[PDB]
Subunit: 260 residues, 6 copies
């Protein structure tokens, strides 16, 4: 059991724990407490012995525009204490929830993902794309921030070092063609951007077919070994990322910038 969140729902169908970002009018921008909620959902899926796959789906034309900076603009003895509680807290927690998750984590990329939300996409085990207009953007250089959500590790791992530097240093998207050239996307469904619902249903339909005859505990057993390849690097990066970001918040540059 868990509280309700009006921007994120979940349901369980057979071996699938399905998380749904359901705030398309605001491009599924997420506040700090929504990221914590996501982490709590993962931890709930992780403790459910009937669950073998955790599927993250979204709504409308964006997967997620990233952190809601209306919530950032909105009691603390210092700026450091403020950002330790408001930024360090939620980033380190949600990122860890994704890094350690034992169930097969699948992202249905119905549209672009930005920032911390795009970082979480990059931590999923498998990504399916609605169409060739999807992209990931990590706009840290334009926001006055640094890598978040384990992207220090995930982006070189999944897109290559040089590509990662070009994208991160100059605030350029990891476009669909770059995703495909790195095998980031396992299947493109080539559906119109206006029907994330049909896309989400189609992915689930195919997953139900693909799991037939499989010994699902083998999936988890394999994931347990595969995770060990980079678990340490991800855990190292998580604490360093959140702590090194603090000087950027406390300097004030990100507030000054994402005001406009």
């Amino acid at each position: 059991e868990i509280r309700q969140n009006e921007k994120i729902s979940y349901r369980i169908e057979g071996p699938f724990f399905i998380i749904h970002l359901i705030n398309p009018d605001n491009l599924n921008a997420l506040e700090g407490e929504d990221y914590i909620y996501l982490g709590e959902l993962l931890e709930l899926a992780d403790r459910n012995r009937d669950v073998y796959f955790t599927i993250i789906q979204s709504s409308g034309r964006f997967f997620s525009s990233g952190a809601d900076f209306k919530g950032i603009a909105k009691k603390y003895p210092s700026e450091t204490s403020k950002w330790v509680s408001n930024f360090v807290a939620r980033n380190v927690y949600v990122t860890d929830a994704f890094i350690k998750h034992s169930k097969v984590l699948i992202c249905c990329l119905n549209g672009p993902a930005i920032g911390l939300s795009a970082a979480l996409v990059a931590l999923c085990d498998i990504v399916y794309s609605i169409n060739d207009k999807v992209y990931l953007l990590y706009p840290f250089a334009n926001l006055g921030l640094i890598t978040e959500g384990g992207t220090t590790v995930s982006l070189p791992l999944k897109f290559g070092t040089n590509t990662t530097y070009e994208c991160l240093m100059f605030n350029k998207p990891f476009k669909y063609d770059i995703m495909c050239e790195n095998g980031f996307i396992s299947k493109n469904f080539n559906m119109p951007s206006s029907n994330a619902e049909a896309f989400n249903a189609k992915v689930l339909e195919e997953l139900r077919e693909k799991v037939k005859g499989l010994y699902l505990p083998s999936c988890l057993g394999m994931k347990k070994l595969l995770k060990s390849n980079h678990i340490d690097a991800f855990n190292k990066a998580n604490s360093v990322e959140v702590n090194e970001s603090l000087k950027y918040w406390v300097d004030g540059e990100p507030l000054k910038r994402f005001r406009q």
Copy 2:
């Protein structure tokens, strides 16, 4: 040094050539054939005249993997330690540590542990674009073997590996090419593996001309150090974590049909 009717070998100058020669059973290998492969690699590795170890096969498959017939002691655990754990840790280690340049001539699909050994090779040449690697662990009620925990993400990427391993889908030729797994496709007919094998060796004889072969080995020694610890770690964990699967009985139940 002992004889094996399913696997031969010969030495031609700096090449130690291993040949899987049981095409009628798609070069399926029993436990003791995997051990023999390990012994052959270890033999090639002690030979100071050998710089390249080339694994070639026969017929339409490179190898269909572990022989299900050979699959079918005071406990179940003891039995599987002797039968599975022993053979897998040994052969996998022989490949991981091999100091000579290890080349696979992929004359057809490779499955399971055999496909794992293909992924541990340094260089892979394909006969044609119909080759594939399949790691059917999820379908067999098993987990990663032969260092695939490390080798598959390394050589195919993490996401691609999950899609293939979680859903028992092949690493097809196109995915091999997109990841540079294959260094040359020879585009030869599958009806003649022998001609493919001869052509690869002909090409290799030409490519080695004028090179300082000790440099090849010196370079490999350093290159190997990139992932040696990860492979060694993966080897002991893979073999020990598979035990619960064998003991549970699920693979045997599935292996019959």
Copy 3:
């Protein structure tokens, strides 16, 4: 810093631009030129106004690698000689690239070979003048082994199997292999008769691209990115340089370097 006739530098805003300016000799570099490169990187790294270190070259080659004439040219042993002439300089220049905190951009106006190609592979971003560029690491044909962190950089940036094919058989990492691995961030598709025009267009484009950005974020992100492989590079540097010694002392490279 001293002047070097073969390598210039200048600062344009946040950019520290190194320019190999010996096109007549395909920008082949002697030991002291590599040290000089290391010294420039270290100077760039201490300049708080610099955020990007851009390495550019001249003519039809980026660099043909180590100058063979310099190798042919007061030591009590062969070991002592090569510790001084090879080990010293490789370990220093490689370290300078590995640790550099500024964003390192290579403008590849043509082929790079050997240690120079190793340095290209240690850069963070690479732009190509056209599709005739390649990298060649001819260690097997020279009687040497991996240099300049290629032990780590080549598998990292080109894949393990591709790296073996190329290194074991002295084959180039051609443009298509570079593109298939995302090694080149942009190909400018300009004539190789005007490296200078290429060099200027890269800088024009970079001036455009940095606009609006918080440049300290670039360095903050690089600081974290560097931590992925820093240990592997440092360990590789030490081992490459020392393990190469037996090749030099045996004499095979010198026997080959004049054929």
Copy 4:
């Protein structure tokens, strides 16, 4: 920086001295006091005249650890509450110690417990007032797990087997165990009725010891020394803080923290 009534600081030459000044409460620290400590370390770290960061305390205890009253005291879930109150502050203060570039010296005027004892174990050098000092990590009796990098620091500085005996059974790392592991560089053998005299004698002795030394060498050496375990500490920090959450959310610690 803001003033804190429980923690002062000052700079004497190359020394940045932090002083816990709440002896009446055995220098128990609330969440915001740990953050404040982190902030002081970070300030010390940015001061180019500082080479040593000296942490001193007052009275008969170094610190009794986290203030229980503060723990007993606007969140949509228990998880959100503890991410904010525990995870945030532990991950921040631990990181501040782990990364600190200045030589970190603890003047142990008495026992340290819990997170405070974890911070003592992250210091580079520890001096004891007398042989009655101990460190206690009471996590097993509080329903918690390792904090403040003790996952790494305790096996590193006390040995694996000793660490298990102490952590598993809630037993102190006593003075004799500290001495047997070289944890204490000097015991001053002074009365515990005058932490202040102890604190002053340490600083007197340090003024003596730094004379003649090239202080940038100290930091250069620490930079390299830190690289031995930096990855392990950073990875431990992340995991300790997140894995502790289930203990807080289950409620066992709160059930125990008022008995």
Copy 5:
């Protein structure tokens, strides 16, 4: 779950107690007894009521190590893969990964692989100051086993380990104490291991009172991560590198006398 006349076990509250009960042969263990030990640890590890796994022995020795009698297949390599490699990778892994707090009651000397298992325990209590650990690998024509590559430098220091291992010298009680290997010496007579074993359990029952036992396991989970990769790497390398020693024949030649 099967019975073993040389090793019993019982569960008392949160303690899973293993008892070596063949004091007449100094608790020498054959290959299948090492496997049984592994199975017992794995059994204790699945038991949610168990927080501590306590290994106790009998008589004057904890264990004299591998049974030389049990020491005395298409090749030598295959034989030693099945007989040595299999058992060693398995038992060593069972100790390395064990999630419960692992306590050894050292009632006397431990030798060889048994001494290696003592070094993998989390906490060690000694009966008296005459206990020692001996790793006689150099004398037997073998190399490190049971993760001692890692455990001995970790727990005794690097230099001390070289002196002992290179020259076949015991890790005596004084060296154990100087390195904090022993958490308590009970100073009881060697003529009564049973009374020592009972006293340790009595003390442990008292020490656990009022503790949150899940914290013990949570802490161990994190602590284990410090060296888990090194131990796993060491396990596969140790077993595979010993093979050449067994195959050469030197250990057998020496084991007879």
Copy 6:
């Protein structure tokens, strides 16, 4: 075969390759080319299949006072190039020779060792002491230098972190009692400091006894595995140590200091 060096001799007796520092009048201070010679001797011992132990012995009352700074005080386009050739070169080479050596490396500590020479002592597998007056001093803080010869790794490994900081930061010796409390010394022979010859002979005498009945290839096989524990850390530290020392040499502080 190898050139002669008037300050360092060697001989082979059975399985022992014995290196002898034989310049007691100058406390076995070593110049750059002498450190290279030491490295070459190790590499020679390493290629000799009859050799299983490499024993380093010295002469007089000091094992070695460290680097000869008459040779440092005594053609290059820059200060950097000078020190790359004169310092970086020899340190990286000799340190590597010790780190990778496959034979059991035993140091007979006949007296104090200082600086790079003391670093090499700390890289040996086994150390025997003549008496309780031996010490190791790493005077880098007083010389204006940093850790050398893998001491970044070896000193925390063999003496503990905290002890190492106290000694290195304040230029204090690792005295005999500290060595013993860390099991650094395997045996103290308790002989007068005036007879390093009798000490050196006694160690060899005991080693000849101790090796009897051993399968010597087992010693090397075990060392091969044991080395793998820290080999990467040592190799990482070697390149970083030599490169980070450069700024100290080029700044000039060490020349200014060890002038006096």
